[PDB]
Design a binder for these strands. Sequence first.
RNA 1: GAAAUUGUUGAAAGGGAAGGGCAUUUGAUCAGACAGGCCAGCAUCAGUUUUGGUGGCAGGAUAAAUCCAUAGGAAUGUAGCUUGCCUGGUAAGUAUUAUAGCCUGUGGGAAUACUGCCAGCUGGGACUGAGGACUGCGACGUAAGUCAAGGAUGCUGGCAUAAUGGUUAUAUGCCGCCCGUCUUGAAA
RNA 2: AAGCUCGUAUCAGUUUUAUGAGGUAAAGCGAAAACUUUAAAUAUGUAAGAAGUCCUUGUUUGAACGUGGACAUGAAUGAAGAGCUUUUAGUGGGCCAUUUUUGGUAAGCAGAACUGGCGAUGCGGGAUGAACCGAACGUAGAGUUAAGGUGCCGGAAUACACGCUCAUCAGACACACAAAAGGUGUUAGUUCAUCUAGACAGCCGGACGGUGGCCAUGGAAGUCGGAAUCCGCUAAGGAGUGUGUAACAACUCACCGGCCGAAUGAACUAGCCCUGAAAAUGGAUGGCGCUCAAGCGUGUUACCUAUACUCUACCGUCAGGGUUGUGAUGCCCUGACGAGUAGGCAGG
RNA 3: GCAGUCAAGCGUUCAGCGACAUUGCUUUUGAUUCUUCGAUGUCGGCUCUUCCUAUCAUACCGAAGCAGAAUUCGGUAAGCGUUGGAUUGUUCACCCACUAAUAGGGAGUAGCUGGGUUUAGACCGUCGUGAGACAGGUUAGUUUACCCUACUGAU
Lengths: 171, 188, 234, 12
Amino acid sequence: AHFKEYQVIGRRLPTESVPEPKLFRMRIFASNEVIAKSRYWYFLQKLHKVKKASGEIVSINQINEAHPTKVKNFGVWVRYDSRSGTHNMYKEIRDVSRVAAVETLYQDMAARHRARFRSIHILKVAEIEKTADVKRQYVKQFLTKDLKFPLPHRVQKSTKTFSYKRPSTFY
Amino acid sequence: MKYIQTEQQIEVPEGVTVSIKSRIVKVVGPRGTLTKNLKHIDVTFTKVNNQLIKVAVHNGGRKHVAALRTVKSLVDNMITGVTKGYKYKMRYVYAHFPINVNIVEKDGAKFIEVRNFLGDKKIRNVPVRDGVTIEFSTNVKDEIVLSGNSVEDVSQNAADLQQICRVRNKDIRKFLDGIYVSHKGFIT
Amino acid sequence: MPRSKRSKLVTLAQTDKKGRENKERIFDEVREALDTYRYVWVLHLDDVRTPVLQEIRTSWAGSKLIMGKRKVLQKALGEKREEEYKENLYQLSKLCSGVTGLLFTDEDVNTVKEYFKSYVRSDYSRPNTKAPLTFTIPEGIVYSRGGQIPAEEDVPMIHSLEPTMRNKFEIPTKIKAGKITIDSPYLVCTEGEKLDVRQALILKQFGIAASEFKVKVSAYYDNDSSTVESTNIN
Amino acid sequence: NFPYKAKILEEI
RNA sequence: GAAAUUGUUGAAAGGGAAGGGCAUUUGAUCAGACAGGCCAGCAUCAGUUUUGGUGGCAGGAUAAAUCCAUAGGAAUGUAGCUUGCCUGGUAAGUAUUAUAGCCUGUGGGAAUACUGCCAGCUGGGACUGAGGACUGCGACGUAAGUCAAGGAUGCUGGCAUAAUGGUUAUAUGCCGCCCGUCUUGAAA
RNA sequence: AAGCUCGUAUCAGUUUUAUGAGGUAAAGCGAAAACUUUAAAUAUGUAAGAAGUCCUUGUUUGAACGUGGACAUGAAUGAAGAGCUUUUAGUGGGCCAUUUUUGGUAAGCAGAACUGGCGAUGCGGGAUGAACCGAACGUAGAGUUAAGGUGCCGGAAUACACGCUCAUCAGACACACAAAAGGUGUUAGUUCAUCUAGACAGCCGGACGGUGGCCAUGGAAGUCGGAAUCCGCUAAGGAGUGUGUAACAACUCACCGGCCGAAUGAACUAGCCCUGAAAAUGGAUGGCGCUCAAGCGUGUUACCUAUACUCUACCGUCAGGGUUGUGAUGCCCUGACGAGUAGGCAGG
RNA sequence: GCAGUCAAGCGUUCAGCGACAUUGCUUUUGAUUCUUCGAUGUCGGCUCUUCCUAUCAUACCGAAGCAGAAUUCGGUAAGCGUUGGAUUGUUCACCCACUAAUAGGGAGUAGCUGGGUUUAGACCGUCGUGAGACAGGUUAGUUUACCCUACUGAU
């Protein structure tokens, strides 16, 4: 479903003589808390020998966009392990919020590279501070003064099965 | 990447005017007029200063950009033909049998007649396309000049004229007889 | 371009691009010569035969001639007063426009200018220039030299270049058994006419080196005085 | 091609 | 005095099968009752169930936003100024708010977005009415009594017959391989 | 089936703890990568008390044999079956599937252990089916769903959002053989280069001199053949990249130079398509057909529906109770289920 | 096919695997080929319909020392043709006559068929003391329709 950003922290259980664990923190994009926790546990297991049964979640907090009404350019680290071995991938997306950017990135990955959500790992999502730092042409194109373009071939959705007007598209 | 919009500039000389409909392009000038139906290309035209016309494609792909470029090239060719015109020079070469070329007329079709090619008794008639005039050269022996406003018509006529004299089943390395386009240039 | 792109014509040549290393070397050489010699000259030689260039270079072994990319020479001489290597050197660099050209020598200025005024050598038509005089091919068999010298000493043109004459030079030539023949006299150039590329190529093929050439120097710089002088001898 | 690749080196 | 089978009268169908099952229109035919028989609408009830309106609440960064104030920053540079052109503006330098505004951090108070809760209210739609004098758990009433509380009662209209209903052939929506033995799997 | 020798206080295709399994290691410092200190499920048996424990106090320090006395309770989850004795229809080496290992080759596969289904099996879906998905088979009413679907046949949106593909027999086709790659067909990425010391590509000039470098030669000047392939001037010239002359000549390229100007070039990765070998009666995504798809990946909603699940009416079977009053085999209340070949029982 | 070299590449972590090429294999003077060695099972032919191109010829083209004639390969091309015969001490083929050519394959056809499965006959050899069969060999020895559909005609 629609993604959400959750702050997930782990404090792998303190054994005898080792209180106050390191309290590792993460930012996980997921549709709900359960999926966020599952992905956090999977990442923690992958990184080091910790396991879900050996630790617990400290706190889960949803990270809301600071400015969900501002248009921003995002640079995203993309690493996916299909079909061949994992390789680095960088994509630039223009969106109003980080969650929308992540959703668009996942949709584009599924559309083009057939990579599934479980097969894609998001390492970094960074907002580009200044213009001209964007490298991909399809994003820099919209960063032009007084950008104006038409929408030719407008199509009107007809609720009725029959039309007597021979609908015309305008223009 | 489906570019938002790409455009090219077409230069219209002061001596000619180009009225354009939805996609029908008409060119008028001193030498004559030309028309072309580009309704199948789906491109847009726009005047800027009465001397330059910009053709732009919004949300067009690479193939659409290529089509825009070829439309611009066709418009430029039409403008040049209307202003300067095109002149094609064709030469016919024979070794033993002289080639006789004459412009016969039947029902106003004005076929180009080639006789005695390689000694063949068959008479080859090449119809003259509209808008292209053929006249035998003078002071340049064994040459025929084709002139017209439309590049496509003159080029097709020359191609057909040279192809009608194809040397069939004989070694091309020895039989040099035929008709070839010696040079392409403008009438002016 | 994912596909349908241009393909480079790969050939197994022995020479390779020199790269930025040659430009850096020439930059360093120019900055060294700017102080190693008392005088600096800018020579505007648009085009010259390599033997002629070597003869000019060896005309005075006690001097160094520096050439190459114009931008590299300009940067070595300095593009602005804020970074010019020598005082007022920006002015000298500003004057270079053609295929320069940078001569460093300690020889007397008057001697150098007199030598450049007197030095002259033959050159090809160099199109985009007024033709020296009219030339017409004989109304018959075409020879290698175009019949400028008596036809007895000339030799018939080789058939191998006849396609070059037809397609490139655009002359209605026809092939005869042993010779190349034209039915009418063909005029290649006329007095005072602007030489076209095809006419220049025809003249070069016929070896008509009737045009003269002399190097063009726009100004010279006195290192000791550190002042630019705009000597404009032709 | 990452505009802020330097920040990774700074963090390292 | 049966069927297999055949002839006559009576009814029905037929565009390369027929026969059967769930479902209904049609012909034909048919048993039923008494101060009660058949079919429906309305009102308010119990169970199941479907779709709307709307009110009050607990959580987020005690939502983030938006918005006001504040210190700074910048250009896809606002006003003004400067350089070239000149058909009143034009191309690039300047200028951080001026004859627009944007971003960062801080200070300030609301609501909305999302989740959940209400032993909150309420409209409409469909099926079911099983049990058969009381015994029990409950609610409102000072009480008398009543009630949506261990399964529906009241009112109204027509027909009192082939109208509902059963049988039957065709009319049509869908399904439907020939039984028995064997193998018990190309299963054929 | 008759047993009741039980009202089982014991049972279990399950879970937890103790000990382990081959040590798979995921360190590791120790004696400086030389140790196992220590750290975890892939795949599993045994043990969890009442016929259990404690005391005692004769015998055979050790250890093991004996009488007597004391306490009537030892993890979670679910449940009222301890099994034997009287014996009895049918059947006994049958087909497919995941897993562990074990032995093999053009390719299949062979020999074993465990685990399910089919047989004996209906119902919905995948067009069509012994194994594929769903799924607890009495007769009915209402409602909600599985898998599969929502352009028609066909009940349901020609629904919403991002991209991907023009195929001169794509696609809706199994995930596996043809399959290694090739496309100046397309979309997105990874790694290296040149760049106002003017990036790529476009037009013009240089492309020298020792030199026509040494062997052969009728001819061999860079470009028929064999060893060299040395050095000067540059911005550059390679004893020569190719065309052509008997022989040069000439044209041209590697590079450089001059004009415009700004991004360009090289190798790979991933997504879709064309090839990647196809004949015999004429036909197949199920057919029509579909191209911002009615093809593809994925997200968000809404709806169709099975004999699947929720509520209720009725028949039967089973089980627990009440019942001294024209039939205690009679009547009433409550609760759970109703598949099935051979075969057994009971009632008609 | 086996035995080796090289690596464009993949890669116990990049030692091993490995594409395209490549060496040894099975009388150098057109000389001979007088080898031609076991198919345990049939193949081969009369009438006749259709279909595939992996095309023999006709049609249209490109590349080949294509001077012509003539010939080779390749691209499309199934519309039309692909024949008359000797040979059984074998005929899993073959020769020579024309023609532009005599290309390869499926549906096979209880319609007819000759070899082959062949049954009680009979003759020579092997086995076995025999009945008898075999490593052989030779020879004499049901069959449709008037039922339905399919096809050609006709009410």
